[PDB]
Design a protein around this ligand. Structure first.
Ligand SMILES: [Y+2]
Ligand SMILES: [Y+2]
Length: 258
């Protein structure tokens, strides 16, 4: 039949879809003409075109929709089982549910769904865009007690090991809870050993603004204004240097952020 018909049949004869070249060759159409037909069929809603770099990959819209379904099932499961984690490792999601797809297509697929506002792509993890943690009452209490320990500690936060012992948790478990609290903005990571209650960090910065208001300051001066040991204050200052709140000028620091 006509090129449109021939091409449509070819696309249907490929469950996992096929790329631009394959389609053109099989339809005996030029690359240029194949693109034009693929582009129009896409605008018609009959086909879905994944833009894999400067290459094109065609799949039946029915199949594209089924793929989205495999993702929600995969994420629904991961999210319910690991409420504290941000998402499923990109690779795990790929090998477990999209092993039949070329890696490049899988990537373009995550991109499109991300651009449509369906997924949250952070680091190398994939999460449903509207992912809402569902904790058990025991998990909720631990998050509460955990946040309170840091809140009460103010500018003398307990170390990772200390908290680990107190609540008697394994390193793996505590890191997961703390990282979740960091994402919710309850805590801020100063370094691998120290996390600070966000509100406490805000007050500490105000202390630092007041300290700096009369001239550059050294570690010893920050130590006294915060009434906290250098053990907690140096890591704080290096963290503040990093987010550009403070700035080292010589052997002292000035405040260069709000
Ligand atoms: Y892209
Ligand atoms: Y110096």
């Amino acid at each position: 039949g006509s090129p449109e018909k021939i091409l449509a049949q070819i696309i249907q004869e490929h469950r996992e879809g096929l790329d631009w070249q394959e389609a053109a060759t099989r339809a005996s159409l030029s690359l240029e003409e194949t693109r034009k037909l693929l582009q129009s069929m896409a605008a018609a809603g009959q086909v879905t075109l994944l833009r894999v770099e400067n290459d094109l990959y065609a799949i039946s819209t029915e199949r594209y929709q089924a793929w989205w379904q495999a993702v929600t099932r995969a994420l629904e499961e991961f999210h319910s089982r690991y409420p504290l984690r941000p998402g499923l490792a990109r690779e795990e999601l790929r090998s477990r549910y999209f092993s039949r797809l070329p890696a490049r297509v899988y990537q373009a697929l995550l991109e499109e769904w991300s651009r449509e506002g369906r997924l949250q792509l952070a680091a190398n993890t994939v999460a449903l865009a509207g992912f809402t943690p569902s904790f058990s009452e025991t998990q909720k209490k631990l998050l509460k007690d955990l946040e309170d320990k840091y809140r009460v500690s103010r500018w003398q936060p307990p170390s990772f090991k200390e908290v680990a012992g107190s609540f008697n948790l394994d390193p793996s478990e505590l890191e997961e809870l703390l990282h979740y609290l960091v994402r919710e903005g309850v805590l801020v990571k100063i370094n691998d050993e120290f996390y600070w209650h966000r509100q406490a960090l805000g007050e500490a910065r105000e202390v630092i603004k007041n300290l700096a208001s009369t001239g550059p300051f050294g570690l010893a001066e920050a130590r006294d204004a915060l009434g906290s040991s250098r053990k907690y204050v140096l890591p704080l200052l290096e963290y503040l240097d990093q987010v550009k709140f403070t700035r080292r000028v010589g052997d002292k620091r000035v405040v260069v952020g709000n």
